[PDB]
Amino acid sequence: SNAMRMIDIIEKKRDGHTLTTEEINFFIGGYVKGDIPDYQASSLAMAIYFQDMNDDERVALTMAMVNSGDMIDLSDIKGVKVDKHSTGGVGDTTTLVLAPLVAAVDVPVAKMSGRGLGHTGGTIDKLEAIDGFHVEIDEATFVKLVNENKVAVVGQSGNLTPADKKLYALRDVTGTVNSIPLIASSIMSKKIAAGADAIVLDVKTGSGAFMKTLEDAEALAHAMVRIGNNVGRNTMAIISDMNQPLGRAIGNALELQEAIDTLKGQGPKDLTELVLTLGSQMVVLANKAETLEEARALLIEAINSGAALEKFKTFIKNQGGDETVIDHPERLPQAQYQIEYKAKKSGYVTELVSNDIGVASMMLGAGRLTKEDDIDLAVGIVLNKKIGDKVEEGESLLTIHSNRQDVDDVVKKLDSSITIADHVVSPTLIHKIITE
Amino acid sequence: SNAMRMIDIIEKKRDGHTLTTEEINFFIGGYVKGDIPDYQASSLAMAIYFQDMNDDERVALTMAMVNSGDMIDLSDIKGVKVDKHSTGGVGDTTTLVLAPLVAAVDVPVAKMSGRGLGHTGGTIDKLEAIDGFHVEIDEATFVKLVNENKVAVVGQSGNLTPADKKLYALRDVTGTVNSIPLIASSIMSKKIAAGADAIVLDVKTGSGAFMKTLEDAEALAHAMVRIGNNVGRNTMAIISDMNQPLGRAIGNALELQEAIDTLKGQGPKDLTELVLTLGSQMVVLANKAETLEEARALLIEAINSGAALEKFKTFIKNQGGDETVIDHPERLPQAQYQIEYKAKKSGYVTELVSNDIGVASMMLGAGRLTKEDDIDLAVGIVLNKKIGDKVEEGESLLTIHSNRQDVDDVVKKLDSSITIADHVVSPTLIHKIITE
Ligand SMILES: Cc1cn([C@H]2C[C@H](O)[C@@H](CO)O2)c(=O)[nH]c1=O
Ligand SMILES: Cc1cn([C@H]2C[C@H](O)[C@@H](CO)O2)c(=O)[nH]c1=O
Numbered sequence: 001s002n003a004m005r006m007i008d009i010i011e012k013k014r015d016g017h018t019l020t021t022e023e024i025n026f027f028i029g030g031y032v033k034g035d036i037p038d039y040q041a042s043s044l045a046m047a048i049y050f051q052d053m054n055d056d057e058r059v060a061l062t063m064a065m066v067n068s069g070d071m072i073d074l075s076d077i078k079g080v081k082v083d084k085h086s087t088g089g090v091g092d093t094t095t096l097v098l099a100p101l102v103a104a105v106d107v108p109v110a111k112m113s114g115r116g117l118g119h120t121g122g123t124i125d126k127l128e129a130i131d132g133f134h135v136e137i138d139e140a141t142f143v144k145l146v147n148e149n150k151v152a153v154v155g156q157s158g159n160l161t162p163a164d165k166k167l168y169a170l171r172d173v174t175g176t177v178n179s180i181p182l183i184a185s186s187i188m189s190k191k192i193a194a195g196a197d198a199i200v201l202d203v204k205t206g207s208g209a210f211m212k213t214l215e216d217a218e219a220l221a222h223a224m225v226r227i228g229n230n231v232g233r234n235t236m237a238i239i240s241d242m243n244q245p246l247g248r249a250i251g252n253a254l255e256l257q258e259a260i261d262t263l264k265g266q267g268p269k270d271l272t273e274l275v276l277t278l279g280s281q282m283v284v285l286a287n288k289a290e291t292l293e294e295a296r297a298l299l300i301e302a303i304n305s306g307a308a309l310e311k312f313k314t315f316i317k318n319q320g321g322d323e324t325v326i327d328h329p330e331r332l333p334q335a336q337y338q339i340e341y342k343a344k345k346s347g348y349v350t351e352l353v354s355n356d357i358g359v360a361s362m363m364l365g366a367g368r369l370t371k372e373d374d375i376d377l378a379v380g381i382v383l384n385k386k387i388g389d390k391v392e393e394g395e396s397l398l399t400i401h402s403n404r405q406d407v408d409d410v411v412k413k414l415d416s417s418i419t420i421a422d423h424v425v426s427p428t429l430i431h432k433i434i435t436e
Numbered sequence: 437s438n439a440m441r442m443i444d445i446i447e448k449k450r451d452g453h454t455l456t457t458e459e460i461n462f463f464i465g466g467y468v469k470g471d472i473p474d475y476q477a478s479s480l481a482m483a484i485y486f487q488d489m490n491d492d493e494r495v496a497l498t499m500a501m502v503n504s505g506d507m508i509d510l511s512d513i514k515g516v517k518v519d520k521h522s523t524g525g526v527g528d529t530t531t532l533v534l535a536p537l538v539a540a541v542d543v544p545v546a547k548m549s550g551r552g553l554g555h556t557g558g559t560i561d562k563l564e565a566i567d568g569f570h571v572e573i574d575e576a577t578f579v580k581l582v583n584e585n586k587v588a589v590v591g592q593s594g595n596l597t598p599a600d601k602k603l604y605a606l607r608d609v610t611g612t613v614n615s616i617p618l619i620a621s622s623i624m625s626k627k628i629a630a631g632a633d634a635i636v637l638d639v640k641t642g643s644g645a646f647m648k649t650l651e652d653a654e655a656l657a658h659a660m661v662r663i664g665n666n667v668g669r670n671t672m673a674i675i676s677d678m679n680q681p682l683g684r685a686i687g688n689a690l691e692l693q694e695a696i697d698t699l700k701g702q703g704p705k706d707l708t709e710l711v712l713t714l715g716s717q718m719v720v721l722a723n724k725a726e727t728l729e730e731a732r733a734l735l736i737e738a739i740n741s742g743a744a745l746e747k748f749k750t751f752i753k754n755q756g757g758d759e760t761v762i763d764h765p766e767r768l769p770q771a772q773y774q775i776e777y778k779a780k781k782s783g784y785v786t787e788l789v790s791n792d793i794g795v796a797s798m799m800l801g802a803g804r805l806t807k808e809d810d811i812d813l814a815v816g817i818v819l820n821k822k823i824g825d826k827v828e829e830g831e832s833l834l835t836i837h838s839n840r841q842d843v844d845d846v847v848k849k850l851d852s853s854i855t856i857a858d859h860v861v862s863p864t865l866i867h868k869i870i871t872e
Contacts, residue, residue: 002611010611014485038475043610046482049450171438174479175446 208354249378644790687816
């Protein structure tokens with residue numbers, strides 16, 4: 001019986017034993033069909049939380065979830081399609097730069113993105129700051145664009161990893177999100193289902209990260225790298241710092257402006273370094289260089305020669321956008337009110353609580369609570385100081401870009417998020433580069 | 437919110453922390469109302485399975501479940517109402533003897549029993565072997581009978597510990613039955629809800645027991661004793677052997693005949709010793725003796741003088757039964773066919789698998805699979821040899837009492853259950869007597 005088979009699987013894992021591939025497939029298939037109840041799935045997840053899963057179990061779980069839905073076939077796109085996944089963070093504007101940059105060195109960027117919920121818009125929301133831009137292209141058009149220009153962007157497919165949509169939602173309401181085998185299989189399933197030949201992972205660490213400690217970020221990164229390599233989608237990872245927002249801009253059009261600056265070699269130093277580190281991994285994985293150092297050289301030349309920016313314009317143009325805005329980004333959506341937020345004392349910026357700066361930006365209209373909320377593409381925060389920068393009393397810490405006069409509640413959220421005290425060093429941005 | 441409060445409780449226990457009484461009450465109250473879903477309850481149960489609960493948590497859980505339903509008020513019955521609970525076992529015919537025996541030494545037996553599912557009938561099914569006997573008495577009648585005769589029996593009330601009915605059923609389908617805090621609170625809640633002033637626990641051990649190992653039986657017994665004493669329902673326990681069926685008779689009317697023999701001091705030695713051990717605890721708990729040895733003397737005198745048996749007759753008479761059957765038990769329901777089951781080789785009986793002998797008896801009609809099945813009160817097994825008894829090839833191991841000619845399938849089940857080999861000692865029946 002379904003009931004007894006699942007009771008036996010639950011007790012087996014509870015008792016510390018390894019599940020077979022067939023047992024894992026039976027669970028996922030049965031769960032996604034509605035044949036195995038949420039209450040048995042949660043019990044198994046909690047048993048997994050305590051007793052864990054080995055790599056073979058983790059791969060079986062990953063692939064069962066892949067096989068629950070759409071498997072996007074990118075085989076007609078020439079070359080090695082490498083995809084980057086970030087566990088997430090306030091100011092993470094890397095995808096905007098990485099797509100044209102990597103494409104500009106002949107690496108196919110077959111990107112599936114979204115809109116969604118969060119402090120700020122998803123990559124597609126940000127790109128829609130450009131008049132005309134859209135992602136309403138069909139399959140054959142996506143394939144053609146990547147073959148001809150090495151870049152294109154579509155939105156989410158309709159049925160990627162339904163077993164994971166269901167299980168993550170359950171994990172979130174039953175205390176079972178924070179378990180390595182469940183996180184690793186969850187993240188990796190979606191990237192594998194989306195068609196990636198190879199995967200680069202940006203695993204954040206620090207107070208603004210999912211994995212707050214370096215040890216936990218490392219554990220998760222290695223676990224995902226081993227899954228990918230085992231299934232034959234070559235995988236590498238970086239552990240990067242999120243003890244403060246990345247770059248300066250937190251918003252939609254504002255982040256697009258920063259991406260444009262970076263693509264001209266005039267962006268924030270942190271964002272530039274993360275881009276070059278992740279890009280270098282992507283270039284090597286795509287067999288467009290033998291070493292990270294060779295890859296980084298290619299990328300910097302692409303930026304310096306203008307090729308990176310020109311590729312961004314081609315990308316925007318090819319999907320309906322007015323690419324002349326890239327050359328004249330002063331014409332992007334501009335907030336009516338630019339309100340300086342000043343340091344209340346002199347010293348050094350020692351703390352910037354990322355998530356709360358994200359909430360502050362969101363409260364201006366930069367992001368959604370519900371799929372039905374509308375985003376204001378013009379609004380956000382631009383940080384004028386980062387951790388370790390000197391600041392004097394009365395100097396601007398950041399600029400608030402608002403389309404409303406009253407930003408009292410945004411200012412109080414920023415008040416809770418900034419600490420000024422005596423000198424500290426800038427935190428190290430790239431903690432670890434993982435190739436195994 | 438209900439959802440967030442419960443997520444926080446789940447994570448708290450998962451993380452190894454103690455739950456507050458209020459948190460436990462919120463869970464049980466919310467769960468029983470339908471406000472907290474099965475899938476959150478199961479996750480909490482699995483977290484409890486790994487992380488456990490201290491005594492204060494266990495008492496809060498026990499009492500929250502008590503408070504979910506009926507709390508039977510026995511205060512108008514004079515004296516200390518002591519109740520015995522057995523974790524269960526094939527041939528456990530102690531309640532039949534204990535009710536009249538203990539009553540006969542002036543201890544009030546306000547017994548709530550049932551019918552139910554199992555290898556054989558419940559205590560009420562067995563008593564219904566006597567023509568006329570019934571438990572259709574009201575509250576005031578039950579109270580009067582116990583005050584006047586020191587014994588009466590009713591069936592289950594309508595709504596005892598609904599939180600436990602719901603949680604045990606869930607535990608059984610999610611891998612969370614075998615956790616000490618959950619077992620202890622479950623068993624103790626029902627006994628406390630039923631009105632017992634004091635509780636005697638018969639915790640079985642061995643292959644025919646719930647708690648197969650002595651260490652596990654002990655752990656569970658002490659855990660229940662501490663719950664009871666903490667709530668002020670003085671509790672003691674015994675750990676008794678179930679490596680083979682207790683006594684000789686496994687059935688309904690057959691067990692009633694054995695109870696009658698024991699009440700005349702002519703019963704099986706094992707059943708007699710268990711009765712006297714449990715009875716002695718009950719007598720002391722009811723303040724009818726100062727020591728176990730004094731209690732045992734009282735009980736043996738009650739048997740020897742005829743008082744125990746006479747009390748059984750009064751009990752049966754007072755609830756409609758023909759008490760002359762107790763004096764002439766040869767008039768009880770008799771199976772048409774008595775089929776001897778003979779030893780296939782000489783030696784000593786070394787193994788009797790209790791549960792499978794129970795299944796064999798059940799297959800004759802002695803017990804129910806569903807609340808809708810009918811029991812045959814006449815049928816069952818009477819063992820003529822126990823572990824350590826000598827047997828010769830061709831001598832009767834047991835007698836099958838059947839109302840059908842074809843018992844081939846009962847005989848094959850018995851074949852799998854009996855081992856004859858070289859001499860062994862009878863196993864020790866009373867392993868431990870617990871008073872803390
Ligand atoms: C931890 C985790 C996150 N996610 C996604 C959804 C989250 O809202 C987002 C950031 O943690 O990434 C998963 O899909 N699965 C996971 O296991
Ligand atoms: C172990 C356990 C048993 N029981 C009852 C129902 C079982 O079918 C019976 C024998 O284990 O006792 C409980 O009510 N709660 C429990 O936790």
